[PDB]
A paper describes a structure:
Two mutations R15G and L23H in human Cx31.3 have been found to cause nonsyndromic hearing loss, and biochemical study in HeLa cells demonstrated that these mutations inhibit ATP release through Cx31.3 hemichannel. To confirm the ATP transport activity of Cx31.3 hemichannel and the inhibitory effect of R15G mutation, we performed the ATP release assay using purified hemichannels. The result showed that wild-type proteoliposomes, mutant proteoliposomes, and protein-free liposomes retained ~100, ~500, and ~500 pmol of ATPs, respectively. This indicates that wild-type proteoliposomes released most ATPs during the desalting process, while mutant proteoliposomes retained ATPs in the similar level as free liposomes. Compared with the wild-type hemichannel structure, the R15G mutant showed some changes in the polar interaction network between NTH and TM2 and notably decreased the basicity of the cytoplasmic surface. However, we found no major structural change and almost no change in the pore diameter at the cytoplasmic entrance by this mutation. This, together with the ATP transport assay, suggests that ATP molecules cannot freely diffuse through the mutant hemichannel in the entrance-covering NTH conformation. Because the pore diameter (~8 Å) at the cytoplasmic entrance is much smaller than the effective hydrated diameter of ATP (~12 Å), this conformation would not allow ATP to move through the pore without substantial conformational changes of NTHs. The hemichannel structure showed that the entrance-covering NTH conformation forms a small pore slightly bigger than hydrated K+ or Cl− ions, suggesting that the transport of metabolites much bigger than ions would require a conformational change of NTH. This idea is further supported by the ATP-impermeable R15G-mutant hemichannel structure that also adopts a similar NTH conformation. However, it is still unclear how the wild-type hemichannel, but not the mutant, could change the NTH conformation to transport ATP.
Residue numbers in the entry:
A (entry chain B), B (entry chain A), C (entry chain F), D (entry chain E), E (entry chain C), F (entry chain D): 2 to 107, 127 to 221
The structure:
């Protein structure tokens, strides 16, 4: 499997720039290691870190579900696997293309791989942009220290306190930045292919 | 093992379309990673998240068993391994077929693999459809916030409250959708082989 | 290791039918994945799910040991490793047979492997049948919701309640069925070899 | 690494019988899988399963240390790694012997490996026999349900109760039996080499 | 993949000294194993090891967030992955360079790899120096045993006590030293390449 | 990678005796497996196994930090990775030496590897001896059952009790012995190379 892999890497990346050949794979692996290693330590115990000052039955569960209908740990897991779906389809389409041309040749084919590369960058551009909008819409840029809750079966208005709001705010902003750079260099690799000339006409 | 694997991939998928060659393997791996990474965080602590307002001995255990006789985590594990049984039989039948034709040839054989491919898609079509029916029948499309229980040895009617009903509802619908697309593209790969012509006559 | 493995697979299974070549390995792997993935979630916390209504010292430990002298998780682990012992001896006997005939040949030998295949199916037939009898004898087909205990140092008769009896009953029956099919297809692979002709005379 | 491994297996086991070539490696792997999979579930929580009926400070810790100065989980881990030390020295001595005879030959050497095989079986025979004696001496064949303790700083004599004495007794006897068969087949493989003729004269 | 890897190692390190070829990879792996094996045992339970003498609601969470807005475990994880980003870009740039010169040759190229090696050492020099400054700025060289907190909603001034301040002080200084040696030998490998001659003119 | 590894093993160990070729690698792996498998079970819960008879705030944390400023689990992890640093530098220096002599030769070089082997044994001799001195200095040969503590903010003198002092004493002595044999056979492998002749003159 020495000559095989030396012919797949030169075919999968014979029409890309260094931005899409080196810098994007390293940026996407950075986001994956950071989430797996450090994520559960910050956001793993949100439920026990949510203290409400009351004794009615069912008032804490009603207020925590209004504050966080979805945890950030679940959102970020769905984001990394969605963005990997276009990349996995292009790697498989390239694998089977190399096999059906070793037998005979151990134009119409070389132009077939270029249209597939432009298609997965356009999809990743749409999925990354939509994820950032939901992230700002659901959570924002800061996690508060208190929360007021007027919800049934709570009688009146109660006060609820959170733990570690400074460490959660720092991890939230760090993710927004890594995803922003992934979006920027994906849009840049299209321009260098000639999106500008296609844009005008 | 370079020339061997280059002859098994071209034989196992020399009579399939891109729907069954690229899109289905990526859809089935998506469902497996999502379950392993995110599943236990949502549904792992159902039993401690089920609070009933009483003190009789044995009334909580009676009401939780009426509400959830089977957890969704157990249902989804059985679903992914069943659907993988037809795929594992077809990969082994193809392996031994390549070995018994290398010795001599390093019709009746090529037509033997086509009838085996149609057979595992028909089985997966029946198993996916039956699983969705049980899923809607057992759980539905929403997890409630309260539950009324009139069961022995509880005296009267008691009220029991749940935690995180919004995050559980979102994960339930997300699975129903991924399985629906797996069912759709399995039915589609039969049509493109000629199920329509076989259907009429 | 390409030509080597292509000569071991054709020798280990040159005298077996598809029942013993494809269907049995897939059935035994199914039982192993199901136990590892789902087993601990059902039967992992039996001891804390066993509530007795008393305060004497040592009455709970006396009644739980009378009810479950052995957990199902321990029984099923011993069952899968025992059944794998005859399979591991036959794979090693075949490995060393291929090596001592590559040097010279790169009758008395081909007939040596056939008597070893019949011997491990007979052993697995005896071990699977004995395990099912103990399983029905120890546990049965249903896990109850209550249990009466008259044992020292308990004064009188006490009542003890269990949790999740419906999910434990479903997992118990599912295992009995998978093992039953493993027993059936092991007995069937002997008939197709000629057990009937050997039986009569 | 195809021809290399086909020459090491034929050299490491060209002067052994099937008892030492197939049956002993399978017996030693059986004991290792059983310990790792099932061991912690039985003996992992001994300390919390040891209830003494008192309130003095330090009386429970004094009585548990008199009852179990060493857990069975620690004893069995030391036993499996000690017995593996002679096996690892013989595999390395054989590896370097094959390399220093490929260059030239790609009597005094063949007789060098026979004296090393007899030496590791004699060591394993002494280590297995000593371990069984300590096992019977420390623990016995049964784990009791009660324990009387007259030790300082306990005032008088107190009673302490154990949990799950029936499951611990079954696992203890199962290990004694597997180790007994390992001892038997190690002594048998020496006889078949000619220990009887060496014994007399 | 024998001749391939024998040509990549000689190309990636044909213009480096033993300081950058042996000593730096071993120093960076030392810091990674130490963090993974020993880190969580020291700093994993800071929150439960922070006891404040009060009963007001929300005073403990306010004082722990002022004392530790970021844990050392999170800081050190970000430090090791950042420093690995320049190393991963240089390994990929070297891989694709070897492939595009095997076809033709199975000056302008040899000089292309030298400017890339100087660039990743300069980046690692800036990232290591900035991390040490933040480490001294956030934590210092010692973890105290007490902490005074005048913060809302605490009434007055309260006293809070810490656990294991001696083991945390020892692990903190040990990390500062390993990172200091990584900084020293990175600056030294530039001098031996000729930074002094470039510095003056 | 068959001929490559057959030339590295014969070069890395063409000037060593069986003591440094077989017996030392097996002794160092023994110490690593024993620590990983059995270590956390003995010394993992020291903090909860340290009971002091008082109610003042902060007196338990002050006395446990005086008794154990560093756990044995942390000491032994640092000891095994330090001793592995000289071994990792010598394996890398040998790898690059084999590559720069395959091209030409597929005296000054053979004598270069001998001075590197003597250098890593001298370093390991100094690191093993210093570790044993700290081990006896910090912990000793026995773990007590009680401990008297006169430290602020404790009023007077209090008594604190430990759990499992017999199992901790046995594991401590077992490690001291394995490290002693590693020190002995490292000093012995220098003598057999000719340290005696170098010592006198
Ligand atoms: C590109 C631009 C985007 C444009 C907007 C797009 C809008 C998208 C909708 C956003 C969405 C999450 C869904 C997306 C997650 C997908 C991720 C999938 C990953 C899976 C791996 C968040 O909910 C919205 O609702 C707002 C409140 O109304 C929230 O505002 C905050 O509110 C303040 C409270 O005071 C806060 O104090 C403040 O912080 C904000 O003001 C926001 O979170 C958001 O706007 C919708 O959630 C909805 O889900 C359902 C259950 O499915 C919820 O439960 C249902 O109703 C419950 C009774 O209510 C029952 O109990 C439950 O039984 C029932 O089921 C709903 O209730 C609702 O929550
Ligand atoms: C190369 C030379 C460096 C030159 C200096 C550079 C300055 C860098 C800033 C350092 C920085 C950490 C950020 C860096 C971490 C990046 C790592 C990323 C890794 C991610 C994987 C530490 O905070 C600074 O602030 C000082 C206090 O003011 C602290 O001093 C100590 O204080 C004494 C208390 O009495 C101690 O007793 C004593 O020990 C020290 O005196 C120091 O920690 C430091 O100086 C800034 O933190 C800031 O973050 C934000 C939330 O983002 C915090 O929360 C916000 O405000 C809260 C109300 O306040 C709200 O509640 C919260 O809702 C809101 O959000 C802020 O509050 C603030 O903390
Ligand atoms: C393709 C179309 C499908 C067509 C329908 C097919 C029908 C399939 C039957 C569905 C099935 C699960 C079995 C399938 C799981 C297989 C998965 C295997 C994976 C393994 C890896 C769910 O049970 C049915 O029963 C209904 C209630 O009667 C439930 O309705 C809900 O009820 C409302 C309550 O008020 C809820 O409020 C509301 O939410 C619903 O109204 C539904 O869950 C369902 O209809 C049958 O369960 C049965 O199992 C047995 C124990 O085996 C149970 O325990 C036995 O009886 C106990 C005393 O009772 C004893 O204590 C126990 O000792 C004894 O043993 C039974 O009791 C029964 O539960
Ligand atoms: C092919 C056809 C099979 C033909 C039958 C073959 C008979 C096989 C014997 C079955 C066997 C398990 C052993 C097999 C497990 C091997 C698996 C190895 C895997 C290891 C990886 C189950 O015990 C039998 O005994 C019966 C009770 O007498 C049980 O009936 C139930 O009882 C009702 C109670 O009221 C239930 O309510 C109801 O549910 C049933 O009526 C059944 O479980 C069974 O019949 C024997 O167990 C025995 O083990 C010993 C300790 O070794 C036990 O402890 C000893 O005595 C204690 C004082 O007693 C002391 O405290 C203890 O200190 C001492 O040591 C014994 O006590 C005894 O239990
Ligand atoms: C080759 C021959 C060796 C020759 C001797 C060499 C001497 C080496 C010094 C040994 C050393 C460990 C350091 C080595 C570990 C490196 C391992 C690195 C691995 C990392 C992966 C043990 O401390 C010494 O001190 C003695 C006490 O003074 C101890 O004796 C025992 O005491 C009896 C009590 O009554 C016992 O009852 C009895 O059992 C013994 O009598 C012994 O442990 C030892 O002698 C020094 O520890 C020092 O560390 C610092 C924090 O860094 C400690 O904290 C500082 O002060 C605190 C207020 O005090 C503050 O609270 C804290 O905030 C502050 O920071 C110090 O306090 C001090 O402890
Ligand atoms: C081939 C034939 C064998 C021939 C016999 C050879 C004899 C071998 C000695 C056996 C040995 C274990 C050591 C072997 C483990 C090596 C495994 C290594 C694996 C490591 C990976 C078990 O101890 C012996 O002592 C007996 C009691 O005296 C025990 O009997 C039982 O007692 C009844 C009580 O009433 C029971 O009710 C009943 O069940 C039995 O009657 C038996 O366990 C045994 O005979 C010796 O243990 C000794 O260790 C030391 C600490 O090192 C212990 O602690 C020391 O003293 C404490 C004050 O005492 C202090 O508190 C402590 O601070 C101090 O340190 C000692 O106390 C002592 O225990």
């Amino acid at each position: 499997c020495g000559r095989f892999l030396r012919r797949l890497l030169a075919e999968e990346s014979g029409r890309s720039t260094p931005v899409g050949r080196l810098l994007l794979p390293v940026l996407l692996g950075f986001r994956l290691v950071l989430l797996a290693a450090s994520g559960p330590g910050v956001y793993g115990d949100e439920q026990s870190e949510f203290v409400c000052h009351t004794q009615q039955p069912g008032c804490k569960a009603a207020c925590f579900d209004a504050f966080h209908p979805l945890s950030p740990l679940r959102f970020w897991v769905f984001q990394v696997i969605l963005v990997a779906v276009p990349s996995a389809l292009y790697m498989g389409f390239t694998l089977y293309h190399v096999i059906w041309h070793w037998e005979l040749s151990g134009g119409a084919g070389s132009l077939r791989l270029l249209w597939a590369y432009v298609a997965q960058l356009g999809a990743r551009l749409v999925l990354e942009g939509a994820a950032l909008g939901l992230q700002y819409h659901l959570y924002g840029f800061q996690m508060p220290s208190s929360f007021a809750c007027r919800r049934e079966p709570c009688l009146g208005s109660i006060t609820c306190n959170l733990s570690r709001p400074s460490e959660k705010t720092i991890f939230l902003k760090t993710m927004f930045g890594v995803s922003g750079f992934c979006l920027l260099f994906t849009f840049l690799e299209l321009v260098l292919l000639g999106l500008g000339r296609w844009w005008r006409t």
